[PDB]
Homo-oligomer: 161 residues x 4
Amino acid sequence: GRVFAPYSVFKGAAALSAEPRLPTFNRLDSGGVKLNRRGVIMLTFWPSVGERKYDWEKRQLFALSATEVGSLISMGTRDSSEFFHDPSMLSSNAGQVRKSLSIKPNADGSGYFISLSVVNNNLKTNDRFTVPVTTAEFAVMRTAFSFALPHIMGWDRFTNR
Amino acid sequence: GRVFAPYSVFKGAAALSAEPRLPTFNRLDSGGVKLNRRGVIMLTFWPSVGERKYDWEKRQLFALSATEVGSLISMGTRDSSEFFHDPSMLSSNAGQVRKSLSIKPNADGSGYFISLSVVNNNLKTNDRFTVPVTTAEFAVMRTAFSFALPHIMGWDRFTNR
Amino acid sequence: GRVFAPYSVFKGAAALSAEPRLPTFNRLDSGGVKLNRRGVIMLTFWPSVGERKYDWEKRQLFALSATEVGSLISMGTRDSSEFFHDPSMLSSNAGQVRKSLSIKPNADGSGYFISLSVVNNNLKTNDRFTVPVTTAEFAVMRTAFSFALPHIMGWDRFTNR
Amino acid sequence: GRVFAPYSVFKGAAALSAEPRLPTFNRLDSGGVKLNRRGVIMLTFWPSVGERKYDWEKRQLFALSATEVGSLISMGTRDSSEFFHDPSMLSSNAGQVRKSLSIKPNADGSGYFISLSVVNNNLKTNDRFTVPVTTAEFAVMRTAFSFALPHIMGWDRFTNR
DNA sequence: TTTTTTTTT
DNA sequence: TTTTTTTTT
DNA sequence: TTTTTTTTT
DNA sequence: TTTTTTTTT
């Protein structure tokens, strides 16, 4: 069965959620197993419609790859990164939706800003959710993501008993 | 069944103990599972009534959240933090008991001081337990807490087999 | 059964793959178990025959030992290392094939270069596969290898239940 | 059953071995479980009687506690520590055997020196085994010991399923 | 005994 | 296919 | 719902 | 064979 144990951070404008999506495996005819669809750390964003009350309907997703996770956890305090995703890459309708996730340190050094930009040329929409992440919150993420990385990679299958 | 494997540090005035409290889950009707009550790292303090002989009766608890754990493990040597808790928040009798946990580096750099303050306006009591933590002891905590963080978050449920 | 969950990095000239090989154990007559053949992190390299299309036939392997893994993960940004292996050491045909793996930081600091040299004096061949590894990619490796190290050592057998 | 998966380092004068000893638990009448005898990282030393040929008969043991492990893994490159143990503390024959383990960085910075001193006033013996540990070897230890620490503490018993 | 709360499947 | 070897239970 | 793809067993 | 001990459920 599925499991819902998100690490969620709520702030002024929007809320931020993070939970792993494990890899899918195919059992070969030879008996062994082969990783098929790679796992990710799924990031979800949604806005606040009212004093601490958020709109789950207007949520946007962003799937961190193994490498991108590696990038995030290796970030020094004075570091910043930006990831660009096309949800429908290699599909009939590519270049129509563009997603970009950005992590930038804030001036104070009291953590980072993490914002998701989603531009949809099909629906003519332009969404952006920014969420402030303290040092401690980003620390949970770094440690949690470090823990999950081997799993989303399927390396937890390698075990002596 | 339950499990009692505390990491305990004993010192002059008081003693310090730390062990995880796992999250509670509810099995949905849909089959999947959902994290309900979040896990914590439970901290217990108690005084010394006599030459190395402590009073377990006068113990006070403090429950570290995921974020607070993230804060503790991310602490540089020259860092200090303070957490404030109301045990009965959102309850009939709030603001009546106040707890504060403080981690401050000591002058020497030979670790930290960790003290729990508990002010009870109902019972008119004022308790404070301070415990010195060497670099090595705080190292156990940092590593142990890092290990436990994924578990108290319920991320150990995400596993390939 | 076996498991195939490689961490693969594809680049211009060649491709790089990494996955653990667990240790083999023998069950003693006394009942206990004893680690026999030590585990490794297996590295595979292969060339590119055409615009992003690689030759799996011309692959070369390199097996990182526990210690060598320890070396790799302890590398600062400004560090470089080189490992020399004779595949047929202590065998009839030693000194006939020589392998060397090198990790050097690139000028920019944007990661490392990792190249495998294989000199075969029996077949009169001289192969070399170089692959550029970004900071994020090497971060995956560092974290993945850290996770796997206890397992290839067989220390995952030590567990309370 | 027991498990033998030592991390061993062999050098000129002596050899060094390290493997965890898990904690013992007692099942309470209440149903739960309680950690009884604490786990350790067991260190074994033995001399070399001949060109790369060691004397397993003249081995000496040293049991690292949780805290001492915490100390070892927190060591910077320029750090050194010394631990003193009386094997028969709180026993009929205390003060008769004294053990001391020392970790000192070597001049070059190419790792550390680790030596075990055992003075026996009952048998009138004075033993000392020194073993050089490269940066990579000590890296294996740091990572392996970090992995094992939660287990020797019995914190691996805390798990969601 | 424990600072709660915010959104789904 | 893989750099081995050293000491026990 | 999710940026894909490249090579085996 | 191993530095112990301190307080509960």
